[PDB]
């Protein structure tokens, strides 16, 4: 038991360690999506940049949870980072749809972490999650939804014109 | 035999002289492609600029090989620069496809030059080719492939809209 | 088969994909080592910074190989990133010893990749590896060896004084 | 027939296409002369620079004629660029004598082009040639004559002292 | 056996130690040549400066090889630096001829070192030699050849006028 | 006999030539000591810098004596530079002790040179030696003595802590 540990439940500790793995996984999915758009037969450079940015943010989120763990006197236990579900992400629209899905899954896990912190009366953990994670996640999900909507309305994925112009005018 | 000549095989000398002619030819093809896009009935000003830039780079590559020849104590022997295969390059997509083809043919010749330098144990020539030519060539080929992919996906050559917007948003 | 692919052997492609996984793994090991030094019962802030820097460099190395793959017309296939061997890295000296070991293992893999590229007469891949990877790896290994030597001479891991002063005067 | 074509005779069009080839050839001769002076057994660096500058100007002149062709609604037809008459240009004086000769031959062709434009009552072509080509050509020829005179008076080609000092004091 | 040593053959180690001695010797020859030109009965101040610069570069090359040795885990073994063959270097032309000769001898040794590194499959050593040594050596040899050519053409060593003007206009 | 020679005894000339060799040797010893501290199993970077600085100063001292020789109308005769007595300098303290010893040996030779110049009534040589050499040598010896004292008092060579902290706080 850490000399700093206070009001920090075993279950919260375990849940943070799960959250660290999930942020790392999300980072990995976005890394895979970015370089898919860097292929010579896909060639949408701003989709690639957009997803590489999201990838580095997810890693940064992981790092902040790892800092949180040590702050509270918890002990970090890392797990394998699972390769993503796809190697080939099909189109800019499909990738955005999969990103939206992934962000909601990460959000659900954040919400469950907050429920747990509430159940354990850990107001420091509750506020940490609300301050750094919940509103950022909500903004991301709204942005990914906006992107999906625009791509669909432009006639993606069928219109390669649509994905080309979106890359230029929205992601550029 | 030059007072500077050292470890420089007759065959390498001949092969450099062939490479100088090929870079000059590539310069010429790109020159022809540029001014095709400057015609009043083609009128894609950024395709024209793009290909004029590639043309001057090829000439610069020729000049660097000519410098290399003299550096090593070889003797430059120039040959006719052959007019390109086409006068009319048809479309922005077709021109990019022909540029891709040409760059791979030049790359193949660079690779054969490197094999020869290796077979003759000429590490200075090997590194010259790797330093100035191989990665530049690989980048060019990846870029031309990206361009071809985007044009095709936008609906070129049939969509004159596609070639117009590509000229603006990618080459502009 | 990619429109850009040229002189790029199936085996090189596979070997790059293995190298991408290994750089990612090394990134992960360093991430784990960094936050070990951020524990309240370890508390060596510059060891933590040092290893976090190495972690981000490894990720950057992975990203550059992923770019290389697409450049050459290869296809990126990602694998799980394995959790590191330890959760608790014991001391600054032990962590540096494990870092040295890891960097030599990564170097060995780089060397095998270069042998393969040589055997396949792929001078572009040979030079890529020499330019970005081999000398950087040699510098890292020399630096980690210097660090290990100094820690040992100061009386680490037994002297907590030694690890404290090294963190201040060398890593600070 | 181009939508822009006006008062532009078939013969003028053909003559411009001949002029483009000749400027390109002159560029090539000067390129060859430059790198002759870059040989380790010739080694007059400012003769080399001087002739490389003239080479790039000739190419630029070719490009301006190609622009002219398209401006008027003509169609560019490129021909082989013939290798120059010599590989070895003998001395700085001899090269200047050959440059003088070449510039007068190019001038003669410019004058014949102007006669033709006059005979076809094409005042736009007449003025184009007078504005960009005739006075520039006359200056070049006067300069090359000045250079030849000075080299001869200094005792070139026999005095290697003379060619060395001219390179320093006039071309440097 | 060094904790950093990897893929570094005993023969490479020995060959680096030989190369360090040769760069040091070349430094010494150039030092001797410089101060010959500083004699009151020779008095060519820019020949003296030129050769002193080359001398310090050679020492710097030695130092970089010594760094390389330690980088790879090799052990530096220094040998006597032999006094140069001459005390009196006769003329600016003769000194340049001897410098050319010396640089080719050093180049030959560099090439043999590269053959050895290749035979031992040491791509790090191969690239080190190509990156820092081979092109620098080729440039030096081309420059020394240019200098020899110009001196000879001006009428050195017989013309003391020629050596005086070369010192001013080329080395100044 | 040089047109500039005046009041410059054959013995002084010979003694200067001996002094040039000794400064060069001292330069070499310091060069060897520097790179000993650059080994991965020694790793004291500021000891390495300190001794490399001393090395370049000794070379500069040699060069100034060579200038002196020519100034006075003497003739420089160079001898082999002998490899130093050790390859492995053992510790920072031992290296400083050997440096102190070497500097006193060089000082003794300077003093004998001054006695000779005095005996030959060569006030220009006497003052040259006093101005550039004697006080610089005395400062060096006092500094090396200070360093030795501090290392000994800190518990070097046995305390690797002592050598590490001295490198940081005194040589850094
Ligand atoms: Ca798995
Ligand atoms: Ca709150
Ligand atoms: Ca033909
Ligand atoms: Ca596992
Ligand atoms: Ca290389
Ligand atoms: Ca012909
Ligand atoms: Ca000897
Ligand atoms: Ca000896
Ligand atoms: Zn996140
Ligand atoms: Zn090229
Ligand atoms: Zn790496
Ligand atoms: Zn012209
Ligand atoms: Zn050298
Ligand atoms: Zn001294």
Swiss-Prot record, chains A, B, C, D, E, F:
Residues annotated for Fe cation 2 binding in this entry: 58, 103, 137
Keyword Lyase: no
Positions contributing to Fe cation 1 binding: 23, 58, 61
Catalytic activity: 4 Fe(2+) + O2 + 4 H(+) = 4 Fe(3+) + 2 H2O
Domain of life: Eukaryota
Listed GO MF terms: ferric iron binding; ferrous iron binding; ferroxidase activity; identical protein binding; iron ion binding; iron ion sequestering activity
Keyword Metal-binding among UniProt keywords: yes
InterPro entries listed in its UniProt record: Ferritin, Ferritin-like, Ferritin-like_diiron, Ferritin-like_SF, Ferritin_CS, Ferritin_DPS_dom
Consequence of changing residue 18 to A: Abrogates interaction with NCOA4. Fails to localize to punctate lysosomal structures
GO biological process, one term: negative regulation of cell population proliferation
Pfam family, one: Ferritin
Location of the Ferritin-like diiron domain: 6-155
Site (Essential for association with cargo receptor NCOA4) residue list: 18
Gene3D superfamilies linked to this entry: 1.20.1260.10
EC number(s) reported in the record: 1.16.3.1
Annotated keywords: Acetylation, Cytoplasm, Cytoplasmic vesicle, Iron, Iron storage, Lysosome, Metal-binding, Neurodegeneration, Oxidoreductase, Phosphoprotein
Expression (tissue specificity): Expressed in the liver.
Localization, UniProt: Cytoplasm; Lysosome; Cytoplasmic vesicle, Autophagosome
Family to which the UniProt record says this protein belongs: Belongs to the ferritin family.
Disorder cited: Hemochromatosis 5: A disorder of iron metabolism characterized by iron overload. Excess iron is deposited in a variety of organs leading to their failure, and resulting in serious illnesses including cirrhosis, hepatomas, diabetes, cardiomyopathy, arthritis, and hypogonadotropic hypogonadism. Severe effects of the disease usually do not appear until after decades of progressive iron loading.
Subunit structure: Oligomer of 24 subunits. There are two types of subunits: L (light) chain and H (heavy) chain. The major chain can be light or heavy, depending on the species and tissue type. In the human liver, the heavy chain is predominant. The functional molecule forms a roughly spherical shell with a diameter of 12 nm and contains a central cavity into which the insoluble mineral iron core is deposited. Interacts with NCOA4; NCOA4 promotes targeting of the iron-binding ferritin complex to autolysosomes following starvation or iron depletion.
Function: Stores iron in a soluble, non-toxic, readily available form. Important for iron homeostasis. Has ferroxidase activity. Iron is taken up in the ferrous form and deposited as ferric hydroxides after oxidation. Also plays a role in delivery of iron to cells. Mediates iron uptake in capsule cells of the developing kidney. Delivery to lysosomes is mediated by the cargo receptor NCOA4 for autophagic degradation and release of iron.
Name of the protein: Ferritin heavy chain
Organism, as annotated: Homo sapiens (Human)
Lineage start: Eukaryota, Metazoa, Chordata, Craniata, Vertebrata
């Amino acid at each position: 038991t850490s000399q700093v540990r206070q009001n920090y439940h075993q279950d919260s500790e375990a849940a943070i360690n799960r959250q660290i793995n999930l942020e790392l996984y999300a980072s990995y999915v976005y890394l895979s999506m970015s370089y898919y758009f860097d292929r010579d037969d896909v060639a949408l450079k701003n989709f690639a940049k957009y997803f590489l940015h999201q990838s580095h943010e997810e890693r940064e989120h992981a790092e902040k949870l790892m800092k949180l763990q040590n702050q509270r006197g918890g002990r970090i236990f890392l797990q394998d980072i699972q390769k993503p579900d796809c190697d080939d992400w099909e189109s800019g629209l499909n990738a955005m749809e999969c990103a939206l899905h992934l962000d909601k899954n990460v959000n659900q896990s954040l919400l469950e972490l907050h429920k747990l912190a509430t159940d354990k009366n850990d107001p420091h953990l509750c506020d940490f999650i609300e301050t750094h994670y919940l509103n950022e996640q909500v903004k991301a999900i709204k942005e990914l939804g906006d992107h999906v909507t625009n791509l669909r309305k432009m006639g993606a994925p069928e219109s390669g014109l649509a994905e080309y112009l979106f890359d230029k005018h929205t992601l550029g």
